[PDB]
Design a protein around this ligand. Structure first.
Ligand SMILES: [Mn+2]
Ligand SMILES: [Mn+2]
Ligand SMILES: [Zn+2]
Ligand SMILES: [Zn+2]
Lengths: 279, 114, 56, 56, 98, 43, 112, 133, 59, 84, 266, 223, 65
C-alpha cells in the first residue's frame, strides 16, 4: 500500500521557476497520470432528533412558505432527495436534499463544498440504533497535479509545483529521457539532506537493475558502492547526466544530477486554499 | 479551473493574429514581431536562420513568460533591407532546408530494411 | 572608523569625477578659499532643525 | 473588539505563493480566478468610460 | 553458556532456518525464540544492567574509506545484542531511506 | 485527556503510526532521553 | 579543522562550493557536516549526559567518557551515522526543535 | 583615425590560475626596461606560452551598435589575430617616476607601465587591443 | 482482538466481510468512527524517588 | 494655535507622507471628475494626473502641519519643495 | 541533396535511430520538439460510461482509454472536431470506439484495447484501430473484471496534438545528442579527478573522430551532426513521425509566410 | 507579518493558473518560500488608499530598509548563483546568445555592445552583458582581502558608468549587502529604476542560467 | 491500481507489457532486471514504471461488489 511514486527527478536550476522550494513538474508526465489521485469526500446527513412529528425528509424541495434554500441547484437530486451515483456534481450543488418543518419547508441540506467539484461515487442509505435514517454520499474527484500542489521527497523537504513544462521544453538527457520533476540545487547544502541524494543515486541503480534498492539505515551500503553499480550500468557514477536544454537543443554547460526519487503527493491542494472572500 | 484550456497553446482564440509587427523605436531598421500561439519550436528556429543572413544586423527572440504561448522576435536588418523581407527570406530558407531533409529522409528511409 | 552616516560622500565625489570627466593630469581651477570657505559655508546648510533661536 | 481583531476580511485573497522569475520585482501574479473575485470600485469618468463600459 | 567461541548469540543459523522454514510454509515461532531463551524482553529499567552489542558482529573476538567509522568492540561482557538497530525507529521514520 | 482519537487513515503507514503513538500529559519531558533508545522512535 | 580540510579541497567546479562562493544557501558548517565530521552533538550545552547510570547508552560500559560515548558524531552525513551517532544526533536534534519551538513562541510574544 | 601604442613583448609568465579559458600574461618589453605588461587573455582563442613574443598594438579606431561581417570584407584594420576592445579604467598611477595605465576588456584586465604615454594613450574607453602572432 | 470476529478470520473470511485484509486493528469502532486509545504515559507507582529542592524551599 | 508665515521651523520640503496624501486626496478628486488643473498630455489615470499636477506645482492645497504642542504651520503645496 | 542530411543507423517499426548532419542545432531541435509536441494523431478523447461495475472509477478508466494509442496513418484524412463543421463528432472528424466486457468466467476477465471496436464508418482510412504491438494480440490492458462486473463504454477518438495532451504524442522517447567528443566544449565536464576517466563515452563517440590534444580549440566550429533516434508509440509508423515532424514544421513556417503575405491586402 | 517589509504593495499582473506569483527577490522581505506558504493579497478600495499603498508601501520604496540601513531585498538563489557564474572571466558569450540576453533586458537601448573580444570570434564577456542590466552613471568600488586595480583573483568590484570593469558579481555586490550595487543603484538612480534592475539582472542572468544549467549531486559532497 | 498504460516520463506504451512481465517472472523464472530489459524497457524512466508498479487491482477484485 505505497504512498507516492518514483519521480524522474532532476536537480537543476532550470527556467528559474523552481527557486525557493518550488518544483518544475513535467506537464506531460502529469497527462500520462503521474501523481493523479482520487479524492473521496463522503458527506453524512441524518434524520430528526426528538421532535413530536418534526421529521426531516430526504426529498426534492421546490419552495413552499419558507423558501429557505441554498444557491446551489437541486436539478441533480433525485425524487428521493439524493444524487444517484454517476451524476457529476460541482459548484455548490445540493447532494443530500433534506427538509424540515419547524414550530412547512425549511431546507437543511448538505450542499457540495464550495471549492470542490466531483462525481458521485456512492450514495448509501442506512439505519442507526435509534433507527434514524442515514445517508452517506461519497463524491469522487480526480485530482491532477497542478501549480501549487505540494510534493515532498522522503526527507522532510516539501515543495510545490511552480510550473509544469511539457516534455518539449524540459531539459532532456542524451537518452531522450526527461525529468518528471526538476528541483533546485539551492535546497540541498543547507538542509544537509544527503539521504535524498543517496536514495536518488540508489533509486537510479535500482531502476536500471530491477533489484530493489536497500536504503535501510545502518546497512553497509555506501554512496561509493552504489556509485560503482551505477558506473557498471554505464552512467556516470555520481548521478550526473549531460543534458540538453529543451528550448534550443543545446547542451547544458553543467551536468545535472538525474534520478528516480520517491516523491509523495501531500494533501491540502491549491484549490482547497484559494479562498478569496472579497465582499 | 484557472488552468487555461490547453488548445490555447497552438490555437489562436479571437482577435489575435499570428504576427503583430511593431517598428522597434530604439534602433534604425529594426522590427519586433509577436508570434501568437507559437513557442521556441519556431522562435529559436527562425532566429538562427535570421541570424545566418548577413544583411541582418540583429536577431533575437524571447518568450517572456512560460505561461503564455507567444514570443517576440526582433530583427535589425541593414539600411534598405526590409526585416519583413529578411523574415520572408529566412522563412523560405527554412522551408527549403526542411524540403531537403524531408526528401533526404524519405529517401534514406526507403533504403532501410525493417 | 566606520559609522552609519547619511549621504555617502565618497560616492558623490566618485560621481563628480565621472560626471565632469575630471582628469587627474591638469591642475584644478579651485581656489583654496573655494574649498575651505565653500565647505565651511556648506556645513551651515545641512539642516535637520530650523528654529532660529539658540537652543535649536 | 470582534471587528477590532480583523475578522471580516474584505477584498482580500489568499493562496499558495509560487516564485516567478518573469514578474518584475514589484509585481504580484494574481490568478485570473482570484482577480475575478476581488473588485475595485472605480468611478466612471470620461477618462475611463470606454474601458469601464468594456468591462461591464 | 556457548562453549565453541566466546560470547556468542544464542540464536544460531539453525534457529533462523527454522523460522524461515515456517515463513516459506505460508512451526517455529517468535514464541519459540522466547521459550528457548534466545531472545529476551528488556524494559528500560532492566536495560540499565546489561551491555548490548550493536551488531552481532560486535561480538567477534584496510577498513573501507567509503564506510562510516564505527566504535571498537572492547568487551567480553555483552549480555545482549541488538536484533537490528534500525528497529529503534517507529513507523513514520521506518519509511525514510537512509 | 483526549486519550481516544480518530484513527488516521490517510496512508497505511500513517494509520500504523497512529496506533503506536504515545502521549505524555504535562522536569525535561520533551527531550529525547537516553533511556528511550529502542522503545520510542528518536525521529 | 576537519571542516576546513574539505572546504579547501572541493574544486571551483564543485556545485556545493559553487553556491557557497556566490552567496546562495550554504555555509561552512554545511559542507563541514556533509563532507568532513558531523561533529559533537550536545544537549543543554553539554556532551550527551549519562541517562542510564554512568553511561549514555546500554551499549557502552559504565563511566565511558570518550567522544564516541558522550556524543561526538565522527562521521559525515555522506558517510552515514552509527546507531549511537544516529540516536545522539537525534538527541541534539530534538533539543534543536524543542527550543526552536520555544524561540518561536517567546519571540512571537516579545515582538508583540 | 588613430594608432596609440606599439611594441613587441617578452612573455615572462602565463598564469592559468583557477581559470580554464583565461590566462594572465606578464610580458616584459623588447627595447625599454621600463615598459611592462600584465594582461588577461582568452587562451582558448589565442594561446600564449612563456618566453613568447607579442606585437602589442593598442590603437583606437577602425559607438553605435556593432556589425558582424560586411566590414569583414572591407575595413580590415585587423592585420592581427587577437583583437580585444577595452575600457580605460586607467589609474595613471603617477607611480614614482613611471606612468602605469589600466584597461578592462570586459573584465579581462590590462596594465601597462612606462612614462612616454602622456600624449600616447587615451584616458577614455574607446581603445582596442591588437596582438599579431 | 480475541473477542472480535476478524481475529479468527481467514484471508477470504476478510474479503467476504469487506474488511481490508491489510487492516491492522488496534482500534475501536464507535458510532462508526474508528477510535484509537493513545497510549498514555505516566510515572510508575511503588517507586521511591528523591528530589533535591530549590534554594527558596525550606525542605 | 497657528504660526505666522515667517518663523516656520518646519521642513520647506514636502514629506513623503504629505505627497502620499496630496496625491491621494488629489486623485480622489480627479477620479470623481472634479476639474483638473494641468494639461492631460495623454493621461487617463487619476493618480498619474494628480502627480502631474504636483509636478507642475499646480495643486491648490495647503498642508497643515501640527506641532506636538498643538500649534501649527501652514504650507502651500506650491511652497513645498517636492524632492523625494 | 544539399543542406540537411539524414543517415539512418537502425530502422524498425518502433525506431528510426538516425543522424541528422549539416543543420543548425536550432532546426535539429525544432524538429525534435515538433515530434514530441505537434505531430497530429488520433486518440480517445471522450468516454461515455454506460456500465462500469469494475473496481476502477470511470475517469480512471477514461484516462487510460485516452492513453491507448490508436491508428493515425490516415490522420490528415481526418479533421479536428473543432474545425469540422458538424456538431460535436461525426465520421468526418471522429472515430467512435466501443468497449463491452462482462466478467463471464469465475477467473479474472482482463480487458484490452483489442476489445475496443470501431462503431463508426471509417470510410476506408486507416484510423482508430487500437494499436496492438504485443505478442498475444491483447494490446493495452485497460481493466480487470471479476465475475459479475460489467464495463460498457463509448469512446471517441479525436484528432489532437501532444501539446494539447501528451496522449496524442506519436513519439515515445526521442534520443538526441551532438558533439559526443566534447569538441565545441559546449559542456564543462564535472569530475572528482579526471573529466575523461569518469564520464562514460557516448553511443556516438564511435561515429566521430576524437580530438587531437595538440589542437587549438576550434572556435569557428558550429554544431552540426545530431545523432537523434525517434521511438514510436505505435499510433504512427516511426518513419512517418520523423516525416510529419519535418512536415508539420514546414507547415508552421508556411503558416507564417502566409501571414506576412496576408498581412497586407485588406 | 513582523516587519513593514512584509506588507508591501505590488502591481497586479493577472495570470492563468491559481497561486499568487512573486518575484523571487521580494522573497526575504516577506520571509516567504514556496513550499506551501499562503499569502494574503488585499485590494486597496479607495483612490487615496490606492495612492498611499503605491506611494509608501510600494515594493521599490522598500529596497533600502530602515531596519539595518541597508537593502533588504537582494538578488537570490538561482539569479545569484547564476550571476557569479555568468560573471567569471572564463564566461564568454557567442554573438548568437548575446543577442538574446541583450534582447531579454527590456531596458536595453538596442546598441549591441562592441564585444570585448573581436579577434578570431566576436565574443562578449559575461560581465559585458550583465553590465547592460546595470544602467549608466553607476559606479562601485569595493576591495576584498587581496584586490588590486589588477585584482588577481578577479576579486573585489569596480563598475564604471554601468560596465562592471572587474570582480565576480555575487552576494557582496549583487546581494542585499550594505555597499552593494542595489544600495548604490537605489540611492543613485531612484527606487523604481533600481526595482527595474532586479528585473533586468534576473532576466538576463536567469536566461543565461537556463542555457548554462546549474546542479548539485552527491559527487559535490564527496571529499 | 493497474499498470499505467504509458510510462509517465516518455510515454512508452507500458500497460501492454504487464502480464508478459509477470510471466517473464513466474513461468520463465527470470529476475525483474533481466525481464524488464527483455520487454524492451531500456531507459530507467520506463523501467521504474513496471518494476515499481503495485497491482492493487488483483486485491480489489477480491471483494464481492
Ligand atoms: Mn525557506
Ligand atoms: Mn515555507
Ligand atoms: Zn465532424
Ligand atoms: Zn519512459
Amino acid at each position: 500500500l505505497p504512498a507516492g511514486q518514483n519521480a524522474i527527478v532532476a536537480i537543476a536550476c532550470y527556467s528559474g521557476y523552481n527557486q525557493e522550494d518550488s518544483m518544475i513538474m513535467n506537464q506531460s508526465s502529469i497527462d500520462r497520470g503521474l501523481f493523479r489521485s482520487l479524492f473521496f469526500r463522503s458527506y453524512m446527513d441524518q434524520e430528526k432528533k426528538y421532535g413530536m412529528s418534526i421529521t426531516e425528509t430526504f426529498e426534492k424541495p421546490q419552495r413552499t412558505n419558507t423558501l429557505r434554500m441554498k444557491h446551489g441547484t437541486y436539478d441533480k437530486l433525485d425524487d428521493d432527495g439524493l444524487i444517484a451515483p454517476g451524476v457529476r456534481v460541482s459548484g455548490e450543488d445540493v447532494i443530500i436534499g433534506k427538509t424540515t418543518p419547524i414550530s412547512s419547508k425549511r431546507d437543511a441540506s448538505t450542499p457540495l463544498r464550495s471549492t470542490e467539484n466531483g462525481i458521485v461515487d456512492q450514495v448509501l442509505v442506512t439505519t442507526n440504533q435509534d433507527g434514524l435514517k442515514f445517508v452517506k454520499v461519497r463524491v469522487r474527484t480526480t485530482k491532477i497535479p497542478q501549480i501549487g500542489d505540494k510534493f515532498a521527497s522522503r526527507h522532510g523537504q516539501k515543495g510545490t509545483i511552480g510550473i509544469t513544462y511539457r516534455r518539449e521544453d524540459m531539459p532532456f538527457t542524451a537518452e531522450g529521457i526527461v525529468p518528471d520533476l526538476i528541483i533546485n540545487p539551492h535546497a540541498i547544502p543547507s538542509r544537509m539532506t544527503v539521504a535524498h541524494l543517496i536514495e536518488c543515486l540508489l533509486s537510479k541503480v535500482a531502476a536500471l537493475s530491477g533489484n530493489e534498492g536497500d536504503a535501510s539505515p545502518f546497512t553497509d551500503i555506501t554512496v561509493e558502492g552504489i556509485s560503482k553499480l551505477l558506473r557498471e550500468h554505464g552512467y556516470q557514477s555520481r548521478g550526473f547526466e549531460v543534458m540538453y536544454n529543451g528550448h534550443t537543443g543545446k547542451k547544458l554547460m553543467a551536468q545535472i544530477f538525474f534520478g528516480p526519487t520517491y516523491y509523495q503527493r501531500l494533501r491540502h491542494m491549491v484549490d482547497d486554499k484559494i479562498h478569496a472572500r472579497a465582499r | 479551473m484557472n488552468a487555461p484550456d490547453r488548445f490555447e497553446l497552438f490555437l489562436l482564440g479571437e482577435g489575435e493574429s499570428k504576427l503583430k509587427i511593431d517598428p522597434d523605436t530604439k534602433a534604425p531598421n529594426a522590427v519586433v514581431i509577436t508570434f501568437e500561439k507559437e513557442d521556441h519550436t519556431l522562435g529559436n528556429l527562425i532566429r538562427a536562420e535570421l541570424l545566418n543572413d548577413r544583411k541582418v544586423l540583429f536577431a533575437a527572440y524571447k518568450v517572456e513568460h512560460p505561461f503564455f504561448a507567444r514570443f517576440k522576435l526582433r530583427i535589425q536588418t541593414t539600411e534598405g533591407y526590409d526585416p519583413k523581407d529578411a523574415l520572408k527570406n529566412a522563412c523560405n530558407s527554412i522551408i527549403n532546408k526542411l524540403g531537403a531533409l524531408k526528401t533526404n529522409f524519405e529517401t534514406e528511409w526507403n533504403l532501410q530494411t525493417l | 572608523a566606520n559609522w552609519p552616516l547619511p549621504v555617502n560622500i565618497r560616492r558623490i565625489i566618485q560621481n563628480a569625477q565621472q560626471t565632469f570627466h575630471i582628469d587627474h593630469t591638469k591642475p584644478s581651477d579651485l581656489t583654496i578659499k573655494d574649498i575651505v570657505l565653500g565647505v565651511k559655508d556648506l556645513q551651515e546648510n545641512l539642516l535637520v532643525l530650523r528654529g532660529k533661536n539658540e537652543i535649536i | 473588539r470582534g471587528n477590532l481583531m480583523g475578522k471580516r476580511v474584505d477584498f482580500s485573497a489568499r493562496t499558495v505563493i509560487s516564485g516567478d522569475p518573469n514578474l518584475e520585482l514589484d509585481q504580484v501574479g494574481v490568478p485570473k480566478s482570484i482577480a475575478k473575485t476581488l473588485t475595485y470600485p472605480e468611478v466612471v469618468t470620461p477618462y475611463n468610460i470606454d474601458r469601464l463600459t468594456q468591462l461591464v | 553458556d556457548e562453549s565453541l567461541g566466546h560470547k556468542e548469540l544464542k540464536v544460531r543459523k539453525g534457529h533462523i532456518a527454522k523460522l524461515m522454514a515456517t515463513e516459506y510454509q505460508d512451526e517455529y515461532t517468535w514464541s519459540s525464540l522466547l521459550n528457548e531463551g534466545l531472545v529476551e524482553y528488556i524494559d528500560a529499567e532492566e536495560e540499565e544492567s546489561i551491555l548490548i552489542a550493536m551488531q552481532p558482529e560486535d561480538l567477534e573476538p584496510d577498513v573501507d574509506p567509503a564506510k562510516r567509522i564505527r566504535v571498537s568492540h572492547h568487551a567480553t561482557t555483552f549480555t545482549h545484542c541488538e536484533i537490528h538497530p534500525s528497529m529503534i525507529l517507529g513507523v513514520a521514520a521506518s519509511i525514510i531511506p537512509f | 485527556a483526549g486519550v481516544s482519537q480518530v484513527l488516521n487513515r490517510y496512508t497505511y503507514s500513517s494509520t500504523l503510526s497512529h496506533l503506536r503513538r504515545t502521549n505524555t500529559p504535562i522536569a525535561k519531558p520533551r527531550q529525547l532521553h537516553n533511556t528511550h533508545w529502542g522503545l520510542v522512535c528518536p525521529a | 579543522k576537519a571542516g576546513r580540510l574539505a572546504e579547501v579541497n572541493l574544486k571551483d567546479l564543485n556545485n556545493v562550493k559553487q553556491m557557497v562562493m556566490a552567496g546562495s544557501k550554504g555555509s561552512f558548517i554545511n559542507i563541514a557536516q556533509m563532507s568532513a565530521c558531523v561533529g559533537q552533538q550536545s544537549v543543554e550545552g553539554k556532551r550527551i549526559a549519562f541517562g542510564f547510570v554512568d553511561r549514555t547508552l546500554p551499549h557502552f560500559s559504565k563511566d565511558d567518557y570518550s567522544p564516541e560515548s558522550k556524543g561526538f558524531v565522527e562521521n559525515s552525513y555522506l558517510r552515514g551515522l552509527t546507531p549511537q551517532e544516529f540516536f545522539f544526533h537525534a538527541m541534539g536534534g530534538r533539543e534543536g526543535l524543542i527550543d526552536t519551538a520555544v524561540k518561536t513562541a517567546e519571540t512571537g510574544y516579545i515582538q508583540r | 583615425s588613430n594608432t596609440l601604442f606599439d611594441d613587441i613583448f617578452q612573455v615572462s609568465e602565463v598564469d592559468p590560475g583557477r581559470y580554464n579559458k583565461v590566462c594572465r600574461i606578464e610580458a616584459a618589453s623588447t627595447t625599454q626596461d621600463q615598459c611592462k605588461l600584465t594582461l588577461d587573455i582568452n587562451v582558448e582563442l589565442f594561446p600564449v606560452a612563456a618566453q613568447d613574443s607579442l606585437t602589442v598594438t593598442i590603437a583606437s579606431s577602425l559607438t553605435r551598435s556593432w556589425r558582424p561581417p560586411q566590414a569583414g570584407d572591407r575595413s580590415l584594420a585587423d592585420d592581427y589575430d587577437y583583437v580585444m576592445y577595452g575600457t580605460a579604467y586607467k589609474f595613471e598611477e603617477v607611480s614614482k617616476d613611471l606612468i602605469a595605465v589600466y584597461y578592462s576588456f570586459g573584465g579581462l584586465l590590462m596594465r601597462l607601465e612606462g612614462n612616454y604615454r602622456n600624449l600616447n594613450n587615451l584616458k577614455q574607453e574607446n581603445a582596442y587591443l591588437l596582438i599579431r602572432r | 482482538s480475541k473477542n472480535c470476529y476478524l481475529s479468527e478470520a481467514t484471508e477470504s473470511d476478510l474479503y467476504k466481510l469487506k474488511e481490508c485484509p491489510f487492516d491492522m486493528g488496534g482500534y475501536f469502532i464507535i458510532n462508526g468512527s474508528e477510535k484509537v486509545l493513545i497510549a498514555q504515559e505516566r510515572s510508575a507507582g511503588n517507586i521511591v524517588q528523591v528530589f533535591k529542592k530549590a534554594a527558596p524551599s525550606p525542605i | 494655535k497657528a504660526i505666522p508665515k515667517d518663523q516656520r521651523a518646519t521642513t520647506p520640503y514636502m514629506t513623503k507622507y504629505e505627497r502620499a496624501r496630496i496625491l491621494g486626496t488629489r486623485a480622489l478628486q480627479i477620479s470623481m471628475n472634479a476639474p483638473v488643473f494641468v494639461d492631460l498630455e495623454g493621461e487617463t489615470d487619476p493618480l498619474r494626473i494628480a502627480m502631474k499636477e504636483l509636478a507642475e506645482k499646480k495643486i491648490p492645497l495647503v498642508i497643515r502641519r501640527y506641532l506636538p504642542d498643538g500649534s501649527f504651520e501652514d504650507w502651500s503645496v506650491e511652497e513645498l519643495i517636492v524632492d523625494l | 541533396e544539399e543542406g540537411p542530411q539524414v543517415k539512418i543507423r537502425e530502422a524498425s517499426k518502433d525506431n528510426v535511430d538516425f543522424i541528422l548532419s549539416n543543420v543548425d542545432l536550432a532546426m535539429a531541435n525544432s524538429l525534435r520538439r515538433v515530434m514530441i509536441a505537434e505531430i497530429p494523431t488520433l486518440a480517445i478523447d471522450s468516454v461515455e460510461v454506460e456500465t462500469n461495475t469494475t473496481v476502477l472509477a470511470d475517469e480512471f478508466i477514461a484516462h487510460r482509454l485516452g492513453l491507448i494509442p490508436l491508428q493515425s496513418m490516415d490522420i490528415e484524412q481526418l479533421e479536428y472536431s473543432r474545425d469540422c463543421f458538424c456538431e460535436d463528432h461525426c465520421d468526418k472528424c471522429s472515430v467512435v470506439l466501443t468497449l463491452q466486457a462482462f466478467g463471464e468466467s469465475e477467473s479474472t476477465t482482463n480487458v484490452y484495447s483489442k476489445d475496443l471496436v470501431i462503431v463508426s464508418n471509417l470510410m476506408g482510412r486507416n484510423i482508430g484501430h487500437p494499436i496492438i504491438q504485443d505478442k498475444e494480440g491483447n494490446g493495452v490492458l485497460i481493466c480487470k473484471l471479476r465475475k459479475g462486473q460489467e464495463l460498457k463504454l463509448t469512446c471517441v477518438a479525436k484528432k489532437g496534438i501532444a501539446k494539447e495532451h501528451a496522449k496524442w504524442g506519436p513519439a515515445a522517447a526521442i534520443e538526441f545528442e551532438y558533439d559526443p567528443w566534447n569538441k565545441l566544449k559546449h559542456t564543462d565536464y564535472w569530475y572528482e579527478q579526471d573529466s575523461a576517466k569518469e564520464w562514460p563515452q557516448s553511443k556516438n563517440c564511435e561515429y566521430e573522430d576524437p580530438p587531437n590534444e595538440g589542437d587549438p580549440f576550434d572556435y569557428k566550429a558550429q554544431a552540426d551532426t545530431f545523432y537523434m533516434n525517434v521511438e514510436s508509440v505505435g499510433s504512427i509508423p516511426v518513419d512517418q513521425v520523423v516525416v510529419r515532424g519535418i512536415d508539420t514544421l514546414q507547415k508552421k513556417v508556411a503558416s507564417i509566410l502566409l501571414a506576412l503575405t496576408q498581412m497586407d491586402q485588406d | 507579518s513582523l516587519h513593514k517589509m512584509s506588507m508591501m504593495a505590488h502591481r497586479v499582473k493577472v495570470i492563468p493558473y491559481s497561486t499568487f506569483r512573486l518575484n523571487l527577490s521580494v522573497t526575504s522581505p516577506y520571509n516567504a518560500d514556496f513550499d506551501g506558504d499562503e499569502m494574503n493579497l488585499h485590494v486597496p478600495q479607495s483612490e487615496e488608499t490606492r495612492a498611499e499603498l503605491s506611494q509608501l508601501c510600494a515594493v521599490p520604496l522598500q529596497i533600502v530598509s530602515p531596519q539595518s540601513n541597508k537593502p533588504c531585498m537582494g538578488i537570490v538563489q538561482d539569479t545569484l548563483c547564476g550571476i557569479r557564474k555568468l560573471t567569471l572571466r572564463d564566461t564568454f558569450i557567442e554573438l548568437d546568445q548575446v543577442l538574446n540576453m541583450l534582447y531579454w533586458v527590456p531596458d536595453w537601448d538596442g546598441v549591441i555592445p562592441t564585444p570585448a573580444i573581436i579577434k578570431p570570434k566576436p565574443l562578449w564577456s559575461g560581465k559585458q552583458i550583465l553590465s547592460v542590466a546595470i544602467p549608466n552613471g553607476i559606479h562601485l568600488q569595493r576591495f576584498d582581502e587581496g584586490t588590486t586595480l589588477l585584482s588577481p583573483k578577479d576579486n573585489g568590484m569596480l563598475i564604471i558608468d554601468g560596465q562592471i570593469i572587474f570582480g565576480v558579481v555575487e552576494k557582496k555586490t549583487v546581494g542585499s549587502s550594505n555597499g552593494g550595487l542595489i544600495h548604490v543603484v537605489t540611492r543613485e538612480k531612484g527606487p523604481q529604476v533600481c526595482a527595474k534592475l532586479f528585473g533586468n539582472i534576473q532576466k538576463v542572468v536567469n536566461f543565461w542560467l537556463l542555457h548554462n544549467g546549474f546542479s548539485t549531486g552527491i559527487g559535490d559532497t564527496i571529499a | 491500481m493497474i499498470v499505467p498504460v504509458r510510462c509517465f516520463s516518455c510515454g512508452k506504451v507500458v500497460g501492454d507489457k504487464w502480464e508478459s512481465y509477470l510471466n517473464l517472472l513466474q513461468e520463465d523464472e527470470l529476475d525483474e532486471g533481466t525481464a524488464l530489459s527483455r520487454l524492451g524497457l531500456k531507459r530507467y524512466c520506463c523501467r521504474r514504471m513496471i518494476l515499481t508498479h503495485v497491482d492493487l487491482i488483483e486485491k480489489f477484485l477480491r471483494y464481492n461488489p
